[PDB]
Automatic annotation (TrEMBL), chain A:
The gene is psaC. This is Photosystem I iron-sulfur center. [4Fe-4S] cluster 1 binds at residues 10, 13, 16, 57, 63. Apoprotein for the two 4Fe-4S centers FA and FB of photosystem I (PSI); essential for photochemical activity. FB is the terminal electron acceptor of PSI, donating electrons to ferredoxin. The C-terminus interacts with PsaA/B/D and helps assemble the protein into the PSI complex. Required for binding of PsaD and PsaE to PSI. PSI is a plastocyanin/cytochrome c6-ferredoxin oxidoreductase, converting photonic excitation into a charge separation, which transfers an electron from the donor P700 chlorophyll pair to the spectroscopically characterized acceptors A0, A1, FX, FA and FB in turn. [4Fe-4S] cluster 2 binds at residues 20, 47, 50, 53.
Automatic annotation (TrEMBL), chain C:
The chain holds residues 13 to 118 of 751 of the full protein. Chlorophyll a 5 binds at residue 22. Both potential cofactor branches in PSI seem to be active; however, electron transfer seems to proceed preferentially down the path including the phylloquinone bound by PsaA. PsaA and PsaB bind P700, the primary electron donor of photosystem I (PSI), as well as the electron acceptors A0, A1 and FX. PSI is a plastocyanin/cytochrome c6-ferredoxin oxidoreductase, converting photonic excitation into a charge separation, which transfers an electron from the donor P700 chlorophyll pair to the spectroscopically characterized acceptors A0, A1, FX, FA and FB in turn. Oxidized P700 is reduced on the lumenal side of the thylakoid membrane by plastocyanin or cytochrome c6. Chlorophyll a 12 binds at residue 65. It is found in: Plastid, Chloroplast thylakoid membrane. The PsaA/B heterodimer binds the P700 chlorophyll special pair and subsequent electron acceptors. PSI consists of a core antenna complex that captures photons, and an electron transfer chain that converts photonic excitation into a charge separation. The eukaryotic PSI reaction center is composed of at least 11 subunits. Chlorophyll a 15 binds at residue 75. Chlorophyll a 19 binds at residue 104. Chlorophyll a 4 binds at residues 22, 45. The gene is psaA. Chlorophyll a 8 binds at residue 45. This is Photosystem I P700 chlorophyll a apoprotein A1. It comes from Dunaliella salina.
Automatic annotation (TrEMBL), chain E:
It comes from Dunaliella salina (Green alga). Pfam families: PSI_PsaJ. Keywords: Chloroplast, Membrane, Photosynthesis, Photosystem I, Plastid, Thylakoid, Transmembrane, Transmembrane helix. Gene3D superfamilies: Single helix bin. One of its GO terms (biological process) is photosynthesis. This is Photosystem I reaction center subunit IX. The gene is psaJ. One of its GO terms (cellular component) is photosystem I.
Length: 80, 163, 106, 141, 40, 64
């Protein structure tokens, strides 16, 4: 039940998508960049809060932010 | 005198502390022979101890009821009652040395940054340049006020802020 | 089973003494932060991370172990020497119970 | 993809003696995940929970309790052996859901069908202070 | 030799020479002139 | 030409940036209508280790 918002400064590196283990992020076409790509966060219900996505964004300041919030079974990474 | 402190010459506990510290060595000196090296070592320590006590008394120090010398910090009382060498004068002896270190390091930083690859110059120093600046810093207060009155000391809002 | 040796693999010179961080690919670039300094002294003796070759890791290890022996032997010789010139061994030998050892005069 | 592949719950599993990192009571009650892939030969691979196992030529199937345990295995197979796995989500009610290649193409490659979600059209920062939204939830949305 | 002098110009080697200077200077200034506290 | 010249130094004005009120070389500029075309390169690294970032026209100004 975490929140993931991507901002206007994305450049279509795809490094955020490759890093997330839980497949929260995917690439969508867009007209704002040279690469003509942008990220997205359709399924944040599966988000866990590892912040590997933030680690990979090479911008001056991040085009991706994970705002932590209410927890859940999927978010807490509980096998039980 | 001042602050209810006696001079160290007139104090009794000051001389009591001298007779004590010498008695320890005399007892320790009895064990060894006259012409041996342990005897010469202790006699020298005895000679130094006798010199430490008389020199502190000669210097117009102030000893308290415990018998130990006290220092005075206000330059007014220090100059009025002749206790300036204690604190007031060494204050200027340090600041001359401390500013020496700043004026030197500040110049090495500025000059290496005017060239290519200044990062290498920090881990691998230019020793000829460092010695040159280190022997040119005898008159750092002149250069500081020269650089302040000129305005090339401080930077002007070309620095990073956070908000 | 037999002996096997490779002749003159490495040249001996102070060229790499001037270039710290040569062992690692990341550190050979140079410092832009002070973190490069801590990583230098840390990753220095992690030979497994420098290179994948098991042979080079073996050459480095077998030769570094010779260093610890030399470091030990001057330490051990120091105790014998400091015990010879700056000690009371001959006096303690004649009256061991009452006399105490000493080898570090100040 | 062209069409979602439905689950074949009866396929051969790898040769694995067993371990203690398997499924717990949560799986039967809440949900569990299963992964499928197709190998060309018999190989050995590291399991996320436990040790090593031997794949089988043809389809293979595993059961896991977490999505990360499954995607951890996809990254191993896509890199080491260069395969194309696909995994689902199974609830206690028997319902099945097809998750990861939801469009058939992996997420790191674009596709025209996808639609953006949670896309702010502003720079990071450049957003209202919390005082403006003091009595309801959210400064970023 | 150019590389040897460069190694000697590194930070810790230059710091070692500094330390022997400042330390030996202070010690010998306390070997002679023993026990200063007041400056004349 | 839309923007600053190639190889020209410019000063940044993003408040968020590690390089704010700091100078960097212009690596390139795109003239296809992108929101953040101006590519800039600095010598000093940021906290992550990146020394480049695409800035906008309004966010950059002349040196010093
Ligand atoms: C048991 C101690 C020991 C031993 C055997 C080694 C062995 C080694 N270290 Mg290591 N190291 C040690 C302790 C030790 N280290 C410690 C405590 C640190 C600090 C964290 C380091 C930090 C370190 C770094 C950062 C690096 C090494 C490197 C090396 C290799 C370099 C060998 C070389 O150039 O020949 C040395 C040759 C000699 C002849 C030895 C004597 C040289 C003397 C000291 C003359 C120079 C002194 C100079 C004139 C100034 C002082 C004079 C006087 C006061 C002594 C080798 C595997 C380097 C490497 O490439 O490893 C992969 C490297 O980059 N080490
Ligand atoms: C993680 C923390 C960290 C670390 C590891 C460092 C590390 C370093 N900093 Mg640094 N710094 C830090 C945090 C840190 N800093 C912070 C938080 C700040 C505040 C912003 C600074 C601000 C700062 C400044 C402003 C400077 C450094 C400098 C340095 C370098 C010092 C090298 C040195 O002392 O020269 C070697 C040691 C000496 C004592 C030099 C002495 C030279 C004398 C004159 C030679 C004379 C002796 C002679 C040659 C030998 C004769 C011997 C004979 C008798 C036998 C070193 C790389 C300095 C630099 O750039 O390097 C030069 C510098 O100017 N730092
Ligand atoms: C915060 C620093 C500080 C403090 C707390 C004091 C405190 C004191 N100073 Mg002093 N002084 C200082 C700095 C300071 N000094 C400096 C920097 C100088 C210049 C070198 C002097 C020069 C000075 C003189 C010349 C005299 C004092 C005297 C005195 C004492 C009487 C009150 C007084 O100053 O007149 C009232 C001040 C009103 C503003 C008092 C103990 C007097 C003294 O000896 O007391 C018996 C005296 O004659 N001071
Ligand atoms: C009788 C033969 C013999 C002897 C005495 C040794 C002795 C030793 N070997 Mg060894 N070794 C041998 C055969 C031998 N080896 C064979 C046949 C192989 C290959 C199969 C190896 C491969 C081997 C490796 C890979 C390593 C050793 C190491 C060591 C040392 C361990 C350090 C220790 O425990 O402190 C005891 C220390 C001492 C007793 C100090 C004495 C030191 C002197 C110089 C050694 C003298 C013996 C020497 C081997 C004789 C031949 C040298 C001659 C050709 C010049 C020790 C000196 C380690 C090493 O090199 O550490 C430095 C190490 O890593 N050995
Ligand atoms: C584990 C190794 C080890 C350790 C920790 C020590 C520790 C010590 N040694 Mg020792 N020593 C060792 C090994 C060791 N030693 C070995 C292996 C030898 C001989 C092979 C010696 C020979 C030795 C002598 C002959 C003397 C010491 C002294 C000392 C003391 C240091 C003071 C000193 O030398 O000034 C440090 C001096 C320097 C750093 C300057 C460098 C030396 C220059 C080049 C010589 C200048 C002399 C000049 C020409 C006149 C200290 C207790 C001294 C001592 O205790 O005397 C009371 C002393 O006189 N050591
Ligand atoms: C032999 C083992 C050994 C040891 C103990 C050290 C220890 C150190 N190295 Mg190092 N180094 C080694 C081997 C070793 N190195 C080898 C083999 C190499 C490859 C040539 C290097 C290359 C290297 C580089 C390139 C640098 C160091 C630096 C440093 C210092 C870290 C900076 C710090 O904390 O001060 C922080 C200091 C300040 C913030 C202000 C300056 C004040 C300092 C402390 C005064 C000088 C200290 C003096 C060197 C101490 C005497 C030496 C001591 C080990 C006995 C630290 C003293 C860094 C440094 O600047 O050293 C000073 C640095 O940039 N090392
Ligand atoms: C700042 C550095 C410095 C300075 C100015 C001096 C100055 C002096 N030393 Mg000296 N010394 C130093 C460092 C220094 N030392 C160091 C680091 C060592 C290594 C232990 C020595 C070892 C040493 C010895 C062994 C002797 C001197 C002696 C002397 C004096 C006559 C030469 C002279 C006052 C001599 C002396 O006693 O003066 C008559 C003498 O015999 N020094
Ligand atoms: C705030 C820290 C501080 C301060 C202000 C002092 C101040 C002093 N100490 Mg002390 N000391 C300190 C920390 C400090 N110490 C620590 C941490 C230790 C333990 C390591 C000691 C251990 C110690 C001993 C064992 C001795 C001193 C001595 C001295 C005096 C020596 C003056 C001198 O070197 O001659 C003056 C030197 C110069 C004028 C030359 C420098 C100027 C250059 C050349 C320019 C002075 C009052 C000595 C003394 O006489 O005590 C009364 C002494 O015997 N101190
Ligand atoms: C005298 C005395 C005293 C008094 C004091 C006082 C009280 C004072 C005050 C003072 C103050 C109130 C002041 C403040 C201000 C400060 C400042 C402002 C400083 C300056 C600095 C600077 C600016 C810098 C420096 C430098 C460096 C860092 C490096 C480069 C160069 C130089 C060196 C310059 C007492 C009694 C205590 C003690 C004794 C003596
Ligand atoms: C011995 C002798 C002598 C002399 C010598 C000399 C060389 C002199 C001295 C020297 C000097 C020159 C000294 C100095 C001293 C110093 C001092 C005395 C210091 C102290 C310190 C202080 C003052 C501190 C304070 C403080 C505090 C407490 C807190 C706050 C901070 C401060 C830091 C400020 C002669 C010749 C007669 C000879 C015989 C013997
Ligand atoms: S990591 Fe950030 S900059 Fe890179 S493609 Fe994803 S959103 Fe854009
Ligand atoms: S924190 Fe982890 S799971 Fe959540 S969006 Fe970032 S990379 Fe994906």
């Amino acid at each position: 039940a975490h929140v993931v918002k991507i901002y206007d400064t994305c450049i279509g590196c795809t490094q955020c998508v490759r890093a997330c283990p839980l497949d929260v992020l995917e690439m969508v076409p867009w007209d704002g960049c040279k690469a003509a790509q942008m990220a997205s966060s359709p399924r944040t219900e599966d988000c866990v809060g590892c912040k590997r996505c933030e680690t990979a964004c090479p911008t001056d300041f991040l085009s991706v932010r994970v705002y932590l919030g209410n927890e859940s079974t999927r978010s807490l990474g509980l096998a039980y | 005198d001042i602050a209810g402190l006696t001079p160290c010459s007139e104090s009794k506990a000051y001389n009591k502390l001298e007779r004590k510290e010498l008695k320890v060595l005399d007892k320790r000196l009895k064990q060894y022979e006259p012409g041996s090296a342990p005897y010469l070592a202790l006699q020298a320590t005895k000679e130094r101890t006798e010199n430490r006590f008389k020199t502190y008394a000669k210097q117009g120090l102030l000893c308290g009821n415990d018998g130990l010398p006290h220092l005075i910090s206000d330059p007014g009382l220090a100059l009025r009652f002749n206790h300036a060498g204690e604190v007031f004068i060494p204050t200027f002896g340090f600041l001359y040395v401390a500013g020496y270190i700043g004026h030197v390091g500040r110049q090495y930083i500025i000059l290496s940054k005017e060239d290519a690859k200044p990062t290498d110059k920090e881990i691998i120093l230019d020793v000829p340049l460092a010695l040159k600046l280190a022997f040119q810093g005898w008159a750092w207060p002149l250069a500081s006020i020269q650089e302040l009155r000129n305005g090339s000391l401080l930077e002007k809002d070309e620095n990073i802020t956070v908000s | 089973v037999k002996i096997a040796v490779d002749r003159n693999p490495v040249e001996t010179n102070f060229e790499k003494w001037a270039k710290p961080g040569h062992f690692s690919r990341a550190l050979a670039k140079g410092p832009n932060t002070t973190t490069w300094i801590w990583n230098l002294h840390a990753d220095a003796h992690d030979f497994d991370n420098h290179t994948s070759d098991l042979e080079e890791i073996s050459r480095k290890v077998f030769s570094a172990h010779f260093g610890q022996l030399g470091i030990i032997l001057i330490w051990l010789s120091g105790m014998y020497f400091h015990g010879a010139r700056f000690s009371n061994y001959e006096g303690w030998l004649s009256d061991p119970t009452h006399i105490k050892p000493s080898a570090q005069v100040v | 993809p062209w069409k979602q592949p439905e689950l074949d719950p009866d396929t051969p599993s790898p040769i694995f003696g067993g371990s203690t990192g398997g499924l717990l009571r949560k799986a039967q009650v809440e949900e569990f995940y299963v992964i499928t892939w197709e190998s060309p030969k018999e190989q050995i691979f590291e399991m996320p929970t436990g040790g090593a196992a031997i794949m089988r030529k043809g389809p293979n199937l595993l059961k896991f309790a977490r999505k990360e345990q499954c995607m951890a295995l996809t990254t191993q197979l896509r890199s080491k052996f260069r395969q194309t796995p696909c995994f689902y989500r199974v609830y206690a009610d028997g319902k099945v859901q097809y998750l990861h290649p939801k469009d058939g193409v992996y997420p790191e490659k674009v596709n025209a069908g996808r639609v953006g979600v949670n896309q702010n059209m502003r720079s990071i920062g450049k957003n209202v202070d919390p005082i403006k939204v003091v009595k309801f939830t959210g400064s970023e949305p | 030799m150019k590389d040897f002098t460069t190694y000697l110009s590194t930070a810790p080697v230059v710091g070692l020479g500094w330390a022997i200077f400042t330390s030996g200077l202070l010690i010998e200034i306390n070997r002679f002139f023993p026990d200063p506290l007041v400056f004349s | 030409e839309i923007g600053p010249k190639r190889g020209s130094l410019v000063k940044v004005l993003r408040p968020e940036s590690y390089w704010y009120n700091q100078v960097g070389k212009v690596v390139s500029v795109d003239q296809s209508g992108i929101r953040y075309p101006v590519v800039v390169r600095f010598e000093n690294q940021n906290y992550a280790g990146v020394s480049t970032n695409n800035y906008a026209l309004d966010e950059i100004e002349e040196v010093k």
